Design a protein around this ligand. Structure first.
Ligand SMILES: CC1(C)S[C@@H]([C@H](NC(=O)[C@H](N)c2ccccc2)C(=O)O)N[C@H]1C(=O)O
Ligand SMILES: CC1(C)S[C@@H]([C@H](NC(=O)[C@H](N)c2ccccc2)C(=O)O)N[C@H]1C(=O)O
Ligand SMILES: CC1(C)S[C@@H]([C@H](NC(=O)[C@H](N)c2ccccc2)C(=O)O)N[C@H]1C(=O)O
Ligand SMILES: CC1(C)S[C@@H]([C@H](NC(=O)[C@H](N)c2ccccc2)C(=O)O)N[C@H]1C(=O)O
Ligand SMILES: CC1(C)S[C@@H]([C@H](NC(=O)[C@H](N)c2ccccc2)C(=O)O)N[C@H]1C(=O)O
Ligand SMILES: CC1(C)S[C@@H]([C@H](NC(=O)[C@H](N)c2ccccc2)C(=O)O)N[C@H]1C(=O)O
Lengths: 364, 364, 366, 367
């Protein structure tokens, strides 16, 4: 299927080979997507439109930590393991992105996953799993235990490198963004820092924004698109006729405080596309380095060291985050298809035909 | 049983009637304590020495939020709901304190508890439960699913005002503090601001510190006590070989940024008692107001307002936090009895007879 | 002179009457602008292109505090009084925006200004003045003591409500933004929160960004403009043919608590993001938000006329969108107000060309 | 004169040779102390009891930055250069500690000082000087311009290693702590992490706390001391007979720590403060800054990090943490003992903690 560039959307910069977070070597991504039932919602009985996305920073068999730093745009949401990141500048184990109702289940499942796989001696290092959420309340039976431990195990064990599936998959399955269908999006940039070229990879779970504010390549496109407003049982539920999780990977050998700076750049990329951070929109960014690794109980490994005042190197990386974030948000929208879920709520994927026509007229 | 004051330990300030967090009107506390099995530990089979402690800021039937603010001494640990507190200055629902292995189970159980008790329209407000941990790894089968949803429901439903049980109960059941038995401790202060009086209440789950650093009423006491070292064969002390959660309640009508100030005073009380915050010791404080309340979807209720630069009022409140924290820590030690747990690990409660003898000699 | 709207640049939302931070009642703004000397720079002898901008949140005669909260985009810069804002959620006295070399002189001059004007009893409240900077190093003799205490007194005493002068004035005098002339910019929004309408006002001192990244009304405009690259002694100093920090102040009359004003300040980054910049490593980019209705009388009881729920999306989102939109427009207003300037060492920086900008906007938004 | 240990106060741990922040090699400290005038205060005329203390992390000739991190106990005060530290984990130039009224003068004087000493190319790196304050309002003419640019130059240029003067000197000159005379104090700890040894050095400018809360070596000593309450306008101004006739903490270490790790060190200062009993007043600006002298960043160059430490290495980190706590605790008591009785503006009088009584109490408590 076409991604944003394939529909004529222009972006600045140079993407990695895959144009995805897996352009950062060693990163693995997995999804479990849970879609079942239709019609009226009864708590405990669906319909279900949910799932979980797993990102292994160093691959599924790693017991080591990665240097990490975070940022908050608006903190109305959950992201576990973050006190640890703020304190010691690293986290162990995978990142899980999921629906709000699933957080506790995913948290305990990740602990269970370690039993038998991890030397008893290292088990305590597996006790602060990283799990984050956005709310799939319009399309999904949030409280109804739709996600199982097996679902989580499958995503953990199935994760891999290579091309990353986008759209209505994993944690993004039942999400809604800019009043269109939400979901998973990803992008990357290769950035020239003098004689060295680093990779910055971004993955988003998007559940934020209003259509009236949306900009794609700077075009305020909500009013240019006709129809495609959400419905219920065949009635227009929004418009004139009636949260966001950002994961940043890089192979640059950054220290934790430097990774906080990377994470703070995500907001600028979000700003480019028009949203204004709603009061209850939990918008967060987490950045990690795959070259600055911390062997369990060992000496941190830092292959090179970068000066924070080295503008040539840092600006290249910063611009990478902003561009990759901007593009990941548009890739998400393009990858997400129309879906009908709980209570016959219907949310449209941004129309490909209309988008391509608008881009062609604006950028001949 | 005797508490610290009853063994002759002197403290500064004026305690409330119960000398406990429930001296703040409307606050309720419940514990479920899980103690079963003996001998060699097999993961999934126990022995179990764990549990959960619940604090309802406004009582178990409240759907409203309380104003809140937090502080971190050392962030190697988990406390959920804290991004929410940082962002909007309030949290909904109860505080749960538990062992590290139980966090996800407790988180999902709190969601389940709300189903059928809370109106469907208000269920989304129950999706960011507040759950915090310390690790009971020496005495408890941490990964072994010893805590059940029924255990969590019992603490939620059984919580009440009045005197609070301390020692080897609820979340503190399997904990270790200052190389003695750890657990739950609580204390309160009634403070004067001119003609106005307020209550500051403190509950701790203590799992921190080293015997050689411990001070009680300023006395470096670890070297004065004879024996009582842990056995794993003595595992510490001269004969070897032969985290902290602080919850602060107040009826003072404080704004969120003011409650952050209250939370930051906890460290000073901790410091009085000698510990130095170990590298992996997750030490956190959370403060809330029972008079600044936010009805769900309604107008915040702030009955009076306090100036941050009003030293007479603020200092009284700050000193309250420091003193109640100091005493809560000592009350914990005195309430906790000797316990044998997983793998026959044995941890002694600080000896009452020696403690009272030392205090009598120091404070004739 | 024309502002951004007058050149055909479209923006979303409804501005207040003045389209300026002074749309928030009681706010006063003053500038002192220092421009002297030409040619080669000698430290201590200019040329000088610097100054100071004063914002009195409740007017120049107020001794009271305003509720306040801040945010950092990239903290490579100075903004004094901010530990106080983080701790107790208010600040006393005026905000001063200036050049980096002037910070200490301004800080002490603000103390001196209080002597004789403030009851001795209240003097201690004047000891944590609020002073922020961006660096005018290309056009100005930074270390050369060009700004005097009299300059600072003049801005403090001359500040007033009504229309606010923009461009190469006050703290903005010698600044450079998006490789064009930088300076002061301002805008406002009146926002509907149910049955009440609040005002959000923004003033910026802009010294940030690159021409290649710049977006105006979403148009990547750097490559559309012909010429106007900076020069030295007649030599192009940037762009393809070479060789031939940001301070944001947000005022609102919404009765917000300090933690809520932190939320307002965190919205500024989103409006900056709309215009394309990516926050350079040494670009000190900061925002400070205050409420003129939540006031704290010195040694008295705080005055909070009404109270707002953080989870009330209708009210909070209106305010947040106000910050984003006013920030975006303030930044474009700055560029349009700022004229071409030659300063220290014959460094020449062009104001964004009005004729070209208007032609591009007409072509994009018929 | 005597330091705390000399009066029989016991402390835990092993101090460095100097028992001072300068036990960290290469650190230099300088003071300018301004004491002039007597009697009634007139703004602009004194009397003056103020000054400035300078700490060069890598010595007065260094153009390089040091890795750094900070912590706030109560942020009602000023400390410039701290947004920089929070953002990029380092600061350039010296630390200045001074009285509140002097902040702007010191800030500009530090810029002036660089002109002529620093290559024009590197001048921009001198534009975010680090300056912090506590308020000497009871003893000093705060607004009266008692501190001059020459005073600041003298401290910058006169700074050195070796023993550090304590008490009523430099920025601490006019200060008040625990209702006794405040001022400068310093202490150090040499800590063991396996076979490796590191030094943690602490310097304080103390202007905080109440006598009723003070603990020395765990002993609540305010009520045990007889007399020595302050006097203003001739009458006792505090204590049972009243009516009748902020804290700056600087931590240096030679351990090669990253910026986030130095934030952890700075957050340990609160525990050492807690040991001595204060509860952080509403308007008491209490701050800590920690820096590494081995993790250095050459101007416009590659950072130099000679070794690297795991945050989860308890043996190493706990040794360093305990060092901060113990050295902070001792530096606070060393201050009190070093500071002598002073009469200042308006004939306000504040007593140094009495040495004879303190020694007697320690002897009785610790036979
Ligand atoms: C249901 C709402 C009121 S909450 C908001 C939702 N926020 C989140 O998902 C937060 N992580 C979160 C906030 C509070 C509780 C649990 C999760 C979103 O991003 O969609 N959407 C609103 C709404 O649709 O009206
Ligand atoms: C056993 C404790 C309760 S005591 C404490 C520690 N003892 C040791 O570290 C001993 N080397 C040791 C001996 C046998 C097994 C494990 C460690 C001490 O000295 O303070 N650590 C606790 C614990 O391990 O849970
Ligand atoms: C097992 C240890 C290495 S972790 C530490 C323990 N920290 C916590 O409980 C933290 N919340 C936490 C930190 C990391 C993972 C999970 C929980 C404590 O306070 O007892 N004690 C050590 C040890 O005994 O040697
Ligand atoms: C001179 C520079 C290296 S610093 C940067 C400048 N940063 C600031 O003004 C900061 N507040 C600041 C940072 C460090 C010291 C003093 C002020 C800017 O925004 O223009 N521009 C660069 C440059 O022109 O190459
Ligand atoms: C005079 C101090 C050093 S003592 C301390 C305070 N005393 C009082 O506040 C007295 N009511 C007072 C008497 C005369 C003038 C001002 C206050 C106390 O009890 O500890 N405040 C200090 C100070 O103000 O500088
Ligand atoms: C004069 C006071 C009201 S302010 C306080 C003083 N605070 C500071 O020095 C702060 N850095 C500061 C706070 C506010 C403005 C300027 C400095 C202290 O530590 O002694 N003592 C009080 C008082 O004596 O009553």
């Amino acid at each position: 299927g076409p991604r944003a560039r394939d529909l004529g959307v222009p972006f600045e910069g140079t993407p990695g080979a895959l144009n995805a977070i897996t352009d950062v070597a060693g990163v693995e991504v997995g999804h479990t997507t849970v879609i079942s039932g239709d019609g009226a919602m009864v708590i405990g009985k669906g319909p279900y439109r949910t799932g979980v996305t797993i990102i292994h920073p160093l691959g599924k068999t790693s017991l080591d930590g990665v240097a990490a730093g975070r940022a908050v745009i608006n903190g109305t949401g959950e992201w576990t393991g973050m006190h640890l990141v703020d304190e010691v500048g690293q986290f162990l184990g995978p990142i899980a992105l999921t629906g709000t109702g699933n957080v506790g289940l995913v948290h305990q499942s990740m602990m269970d996953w370690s039993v038998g796989k991890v030397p008893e001696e290292a088990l305590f290092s597996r006790l602060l799993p990283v799990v984050a959420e956005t709310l799939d309340n319009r399309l999904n039976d949030v409280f109804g235990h739709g996600l199982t431990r097996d679902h989580v195990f499958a995503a953990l064990d199935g994760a891999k490198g290579g091309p990353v599936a986008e759209g209505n998959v994993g944690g993004g399955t039942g999400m809604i963004a800019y009043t269109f269908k939400g979901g998973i999006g990803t992008s990357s940039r290769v950035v020239s820092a003098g004689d060295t070229r680093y990779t910055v990879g971004v993955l988003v779970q998007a559940n934020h924004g209003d259509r009236n504010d949306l900009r794609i390549a700077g075009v305020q496109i909500g009013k240019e698109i006709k129809g495609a407003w959400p419905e219920v049982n065949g009635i227009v539920a929004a418009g004139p006729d009636a949260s966001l999780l950002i994961v940043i990977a890089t192979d640059a050998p950054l220290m934790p405080h430097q990774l906080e700076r990377m994470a703070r750049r995500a907001a600028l990329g979000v700003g480019r596309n028009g949203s204004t951070a709603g009061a209850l929109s939990g918008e967060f960014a987490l950045a990690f380095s795959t070259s600055h690794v911390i062997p369990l109980g060992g000496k941190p490994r830092l292959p090179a060291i970068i000066n924070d005042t080295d503008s040539e190197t840092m600006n290249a990386l910063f611009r990478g985050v902003v561009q990759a974030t901007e593009e990941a948000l548009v890739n998400q929208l393009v990858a997400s298809e129309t879906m009908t879920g709980a209570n016959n709520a219907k949310v449209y994927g941004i129309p490909h035909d209309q988008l391509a026509r608008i881009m062609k007229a604006r950028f001949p």
